Scaffold this active site. Structure first.
Site, short mmCIF file in Angstrom:
data_model
loop_
_atom_site.label_atom_id
_atom_site.label_comp_id
_atom_site.label_asym_id
_atom_site.label_seq_id
_atom_site.Cartn_x
_atom_site.Cartn_y
_atom_site.Cartn_z
CG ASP A 288 -2.13 0.72 0.78
OD1 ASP A 288 -2.00 1.68 0.11
OD2 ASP A 288 -3.29 0.14 1.43
CD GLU A 488 -6.20 6.50 3.37
OE1 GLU A 488 -6.35 6.92 2.66
OE2 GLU A 488 -5.19 6.09 4.18
#
Ligand SMILES: [Ca+2]
Ligand code: NA
Length: 621
Positions: A288, A488
């Site tokens: 990621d 997030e």
């Protein structure tokens, strides 16, 4: 702890494997490492692609190609051609291996202006419709292909156990069984089924995110610590990977979280022994966004440990050039084995070659690049509208106030009434969604606009007023309220009470109730929240989640047709348990002590005649 072998369908293609071995045998260390590094377009130049021949590059989503915010298909395809040709130029780096462009596809091709935005996963989970999921995958593949991109990140297979996490809405369910049912459908929707059509035509390379346990972090902290035994990691958090791997997903993305104190990106037990050796995943692992920098001993410009742990492609959007040179020196120093880079390159080339990078033309000339109308296609918006209808969960419908006669006089109020950014949520053209306005969503429909279209057709009357002002007293008020958009850690919370700081929406609801106006509340959110007060101020209450671009799906269910008959009934059922108290942080089906307000699987329909009583409004100290 024994993990099951789940790569049971996809068989290797001997012709593809033959090509990989011939390529590997002649490649230098430098060429092999280049395949493993992924720059992002905000930082990459065509000249750098010519010089290094990187194996892939990322559409990070913050900018369109060339710096545009919005770009014609011709512009996307021109950029794709330039990078493709730079990679096929063997000058400077000595080989001609086609690169590929990748992109995150959170709910459609959602980084891209003009894309269809499907409901976020939590609502898709409520829909309980595996065929729908597959079709969404198929639509997404086309919209991605329309921008010249070969590789999309989806599905997201998190199984979320604490709704305080800001990425809860990216999960289909708290229940691993549901995620398992869905994950393989999204994979085959994107890549095609295992068999003759595998990775053909408009089908894309898919990445299943994220391995593993990111939905189990303590207190739901984003990128936090997942404290669970290995059997629990397997049986709760890995269920989506069983079906995604079985359906031949080509890529797996490693997760930001830690497991029992250790960052997953640095954990060879998880990324090699479990994922590759036991589960049998035959594809490639991608990291990621700069996740490698958090591994012990690593930094933005170096991470042998992640590579050695089993990462095959490093997402290093900005520091790729230094990362490249450092990694080469580490291989030469012997601290990254040549066998390891060979395996990484094998797994990655296995995907690109089988997809057809050597056999297809340059991006702009491919058949799947000849259909600009795929991006935001009417047919795809019709699909999304269906998904919206099926995602809605009716929590309360006292005295059967819904469905509302379309010929009535209706007031639509609330901050979310005409705000597409709130109905779409995060990862929608922009990251947080905060700065989006209705014009950032051409061809989308707000909830007010959907209601207005149908009410006008039925000869009713409708008024929009976020603050609930009116001239002619309405027969009913539809009040659209909810969370602001987030992505997030911005969405991590500590308290479950909706708007605990201001209770602004509640004041509006009580204002209308004080005027003796019947109130139907449409609640936009990425997760269940503690809303007893708002429920008490509502005659009906609908959990609409984050429905995406097609807001008229709400009108389809809430309103009658012109003749006054039901047009669509509710079908959705909770895929996350709904809390009765403001401190029920880990309320999950199968819990030993399970006392939800509305259980997993709950959802009223127009066939029910159930009233919900006034609820306790007591909050914890
Ligand atoms: Ca739960
Ligand atoms: Na090259």
């Amino acid at each position: 702890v024994n993990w099951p072998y789940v790569n049971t369908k996809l068989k290797r293609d001997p012709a593809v494997e033959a090509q990989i071995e011939k390529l590997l045998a002649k490649m230098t260390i430098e060429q092999k490492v280049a395949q493993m590094i992924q720059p992002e377009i905000g930082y990459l130049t065509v000249e750098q692609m010519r010089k290094y021949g990187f194996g892939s590059y990322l559409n990070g989503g913050n900018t369109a190609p060339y710096g545009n915010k919005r770009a014609d298909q011709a512009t996307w395809l021109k950029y794709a051609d330039e990078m493709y040709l730079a990679a096929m130029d063997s000058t400077l780096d000595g080989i001609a291996i086609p690169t590929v462009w990748g992109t995150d596809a959170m709910h459609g091709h959602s980084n891209v202006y003009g894309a269809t935005l499907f409901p976020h996963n939590i609502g898709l989970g409520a829909a309980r419709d595996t065929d729908l999921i597959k079709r969404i995958g198929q639509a997404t593949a086309k919209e991605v292909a329309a921008t010249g991109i070969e590789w999309s990140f989806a599905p997201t297979v998190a199984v979320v156990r604490d709704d305080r996490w800001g990425r809860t809405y990216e999960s289909y369910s708290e229940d691993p069984d549901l995620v398992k049912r869905y994950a393989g459908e999204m994979v085959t929707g994107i890549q095609g089924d295992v068999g003759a059509d595998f990775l053909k035509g408009s089908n894309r390379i898919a990445t299943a995110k994220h391995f593993v346990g990111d939905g189990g972090t303590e207190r739901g902290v984003d990128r936090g610590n997942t404290l669970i035994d290995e059997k629990g990691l397997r049986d709760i958090h890995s269920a989506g990977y069983f079906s995604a791997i079985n359906q031949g997903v080509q890529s797996v993305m490693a997760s930001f979280n830690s497991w029992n104190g250790k960052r997953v990106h640095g954990d060879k037990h998880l990324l090699t022994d479990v994922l590759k050796n036991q589960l049998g995943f035959d594809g490639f692992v991608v990291s990621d966004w700069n996740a490698h920098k958090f591994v012990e001993g690593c930094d933005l410009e170096q991470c042998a440990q992640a590579i050695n742990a089993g990462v095959d492609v490093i997402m290093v959007p900005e520091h790729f050039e230094a990362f490249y040179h450092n990694t080469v020196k580490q291989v030469k120093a012997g601290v990254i084995a040549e066998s390891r880079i060979n395996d990484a390159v094998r797994r990655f080339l296995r995907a690109k070659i089988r997809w057809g990078v050597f056999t297809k033309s340059k991006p702009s000339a491919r058949p799947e690049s000849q259909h600009p109308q795929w991006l935001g296609a009417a047919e795809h918006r019709t699909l999304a509208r269906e998904a919206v209808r099926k995602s809605l969960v009716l929590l309360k419908n006292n005295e059967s106030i819904l469905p509302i006669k379309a010929s009535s006089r209706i007031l639509v109020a609330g901050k979310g009434a005409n705000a597409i950014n709130m109905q779409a949520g995060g990862w929608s053209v922009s990251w947080q969604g905060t700065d989006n306005t209705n014009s950032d969503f051409p061809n989308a429909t707000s909830i007010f606009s959907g209601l207005q279209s149908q009410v006008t057709k039925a000869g009713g009357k409708i008024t929009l007023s976020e603050s609930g002002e009116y001239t002619s007293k309405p027969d009913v008020a539809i009040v659209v309220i909810g969370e602001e958009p987030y992505a997030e850690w911005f969405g991590d919370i500590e308290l479950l009470e909706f708007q605990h700081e201001t209770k602004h929406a509640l004041a509006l609801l009580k204002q209308l109730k004080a005027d003796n106006i019947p109130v139907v509340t449409v609640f936009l959110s990425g997760r269940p929240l503690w809303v007893n007060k708002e429920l008490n101020a509502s005659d009906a209450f609908v959990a609409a989640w984050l429905p995406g671009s097609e807001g008229e799906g709400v009108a389809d269910v809430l309103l009658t047709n012109k003749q006054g008959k039901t047009q669509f009934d509710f079908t959705g059922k909770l895929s996350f348990s709904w809390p009765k108290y403001d401190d029920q942080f880990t309320l999950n089906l199968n819990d030993a002590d399970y006392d939800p307000l509305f259980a997993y699987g709950y959802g009223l329909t127009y066939q029910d005649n159930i009233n919900v009583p006034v609820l306790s409004e007591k909050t914890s100290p």
